[PDB]
Ligand binder design. Structure first.
Ligand code: NAD
Ligand code: NAD
Ligand code: CL
Lengths: 343, 343
């Protein structure tokens, strides 16, 4: 029986992966040709967004100009989208994952497998946790992970890229690779899911810093320095936060050095951070004016990491991460991004 | 007896390091105020370059719009600049290094120390030969290495950056660190000089690859994959050809990941590779046309690497390095750069 795929989310990345999945499932027996996608209903240009997608095959708000396959069906009722799904693709901004999980918690088939593409970490009453763990604890299903150098708009343009699937049960990781891989979307599967997921979260901190330096007209040598110092802070953080071993090797997968590079040159965090450094407006204000409903995560993540590093007594060892937080939230002059590199 | 410093070379990067050394020397009791710099003599606007530098204090041809300190003295005579030298900074395009040592072998104090900033490798009889060894064997002095994310035009503008000094005798490495460092030029000293040097050479192959992808208008995701795949090939080459064990950590210094980023985004190899892809002119043509006497190392290094790898039956393990060679010299269609990222 062909495997029914359901996409929870439909934003910039959500839509680009719906395009990928739509065309892939059409050419494999293993996967059901109809792909259900949950769309948080919005009215755009006087019309329900689900209707725009189903009738015109385009998410006009979050992926303008890119046609989606007709076999992707938008759905406003999360429950109806979820029931009967064999594969669940969680591709939604971190700040909505809680409300979505405990809406479908126990209304999904017991045997189903999920993959999370969400970049962020969850701060809750029990502390800092991987988003994947929240989905595990609340859904009771196996969860793999997909993180890589995947700027959505370039993927939708069918430009070559790579990504990393992390999966503690390797056969599940390989199934998702069959679902998602493309000649221009090359996938490596590794077992260290936590380090893969954590890379995708932390890299957005470094992108905000990188964007600040662009605001100061610093150039390529400085940005490379920021990327490199940032990567070292990512590894050092993982060694502390992570359960058991953490191999440097994982940081050389797409999820690590590669995602850090594209995000710091072409990501949305970078662009808003540069605007912050030049205009003196607030992040929140710039987010609303610049991104047409799309969601940053770099600053929020910087705040969560800063808190845990402060609790652990370790801020002095993480000058780059702490600088990004203090410039975002505590009025530290943006010029001091340069300062914390120097010493 | 304050140490007398001398620079062999005067191009884009040489003028930049000569700017740096001129300032740091005046402000340090350890180092002699006046700095001899060897300039291969040329006619610019009807005048000897040497005369331009010494009268106007500006290498108008290779580092235009930056004043070189008055205490840096241009010298046409290579023997003069060299005799009495304590510290020797070697910063010349790789192709000329044989001609240089042949002319000044046994004309330098035996007590003197030298450092190589040259990026590339040399054609040897039993495979891989490093430029630093060709300098050691002919000059008979200790040779340190300096490699990092150092686009000269940005360094000269005093934009923040890092480099890595590679140094088998650490005291030597530490000396050149006191000489060369500034608040905007942060130096780390490591003792695995060969890997550091080898990163410097190989990264220019990846940059030609990245330039080609830019030529095909591939985007940031694709470039991040090229950098990433290039880095793995760099590590894999070093593990095979370096004398002794090679640590991953070395590649996370500025000479590794950082130089790869800055070079693939802002370097001269990338820029000419992009032109190669778009115009269909030859590499040599575009060098003469675009760089006003400045020199590429990327293609040449790729040919040197190709011959080593062919002889040893290793071409299959380095598809990125091989593709770059084949596009540059064997008329392989440039669009096949992508093809070999997919496999
Ligand atoms: N876009 C990219 O270039 C890119 C690339 C790789 C990974 N990612 C990651 O993918 C994840 C998803 O991001 P995206 O780009 O698809 O989303 P997005 O930031 O582009 O878009 C916002 C989405 O939020 C949803 N939304 C807004 N309010 C909501 C509410 N109250 N309840 C439920 N949903 C609501 C909307 O449906 C909308 O589609 C993020 O973790 C992001 O970091 C993004
Ligand atoms: N320019 C940079 O941004 C940069 C940065 C870091 C490292 N490097 C590396 O450092 C080294 C130095 O390069 P550069 O930028 O100073 O050189 P360059 O290519 O910019 O300049 C060419 C120079 O070569 C010399 N030259 C030309 N013909 C010669 C000949 N017939 N005989 C002797 N000398 C001749 C000239 O003196 C001229 O100044 C290279 O290995 C380069 O790859 C360059
Ligand atoms: Cl100047």
């Amino acid at each position: 029986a062909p495997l029914k795929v359901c996409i929870v989310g439909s934003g910039n990345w959500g839509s680009a992966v719906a395009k990928i999945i739509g065309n892939n499932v059409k050419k494999l027996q293993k996967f059901a040709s109809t792909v259900k996608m949950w769309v948080f209903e919005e009215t755009v240009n006087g019309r329900k967004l689900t209707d725009i997608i189903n009738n015109d095959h385009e998410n006009v708000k979050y992926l303008p100009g890119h046609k989606l396959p007709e076999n992707v069906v938008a759905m406003s009722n999360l429950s109806e989208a979820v029931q009967d799904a064999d594969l669940l693709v969680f591709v939604i901004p971190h700040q909505f994952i809680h409300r979505i999980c405990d809406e479908i918690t126990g209304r999904v088939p017991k045997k189903a497998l999920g993959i999370t593409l969400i970049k962020g970490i969850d701060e809750g009453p029990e502390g800092l946790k991987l988003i994947s763990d929240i989905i595990r604890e609340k859904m009771g299903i196996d969860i793999s992970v997909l993180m890589g150098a995947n700027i959505a708009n370039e993927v939708a343009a069918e430009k070559f890229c790579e990504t990393t699937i992390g999966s503690k049960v390797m056969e599940n990781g390989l199934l998702f690779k069959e679902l998602l891989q493309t000649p221009n979307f090359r996938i490596t599967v590794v077992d260290d899911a936590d380090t893969v997921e954590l890379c995708g979260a932390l890299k957005n901190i470094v992108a905000v810093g990188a964007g600040f330096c662009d605001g100061l007209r610093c150039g390529d040598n400085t940005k490379a320095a920021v990327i490199r110092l940032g990567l070292m802070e990512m590894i050092a953080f993982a060694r502390i936060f992570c359960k058991g071993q953490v191999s440097t090797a994982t940081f050389l997968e797409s999820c690590g050095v590669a995602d850090l590079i594209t995000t710091c040159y072409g990501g949305r965090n970078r662009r808003v951070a540069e605007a912050f450094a030049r205009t003196g407006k607030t992040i929140e204000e710039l987010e609303k004016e610049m991104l047409n409903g799309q969601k940053l995560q770099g600053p929020q993540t910087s705040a969560e990491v800063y808190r845990i590093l402060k609790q652990k007594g370790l801020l002095d060892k993480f000058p780059l991460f702490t600088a990004v937080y203090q410039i975002c939230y505590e009025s530290r002059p943006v010029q001091e991004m340069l300062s914390c590199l120097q010493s």
